[PDB]
């Protein structure tokens, strides 16, 4: 692994996959 650029829906998809079966319980929004 090496650190990478991620924006918007790709940053959400990556955080959801790294957070496994948890992720967000609600619909996602940029913050």
């Amino acid at each position: 692994f090496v650190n990478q650029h991620l924006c918007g829906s790709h940053l959400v998809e990556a955080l959801y996959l790294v957070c496994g079966e948890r992720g967000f319980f609600y619909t996602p929004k940029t913050r």
């Binding site: 990478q4 650029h5 991620l6 924006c7 940053l11 790294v18 957070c19 992720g23």
Partner: peptide, 22 residues
């Protein structure tokens, strides 16, 4: 907030974990 910390600069798996908890 959180999107800029991976979008305008690179981020890690440990940051992608933190963005699920924040």
């Amino acid at each position: 907030g959180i999107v800029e910390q991976c979008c305008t600069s690179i981020c890690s798996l440990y940051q992608l974990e933190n963005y699920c908890n924040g």
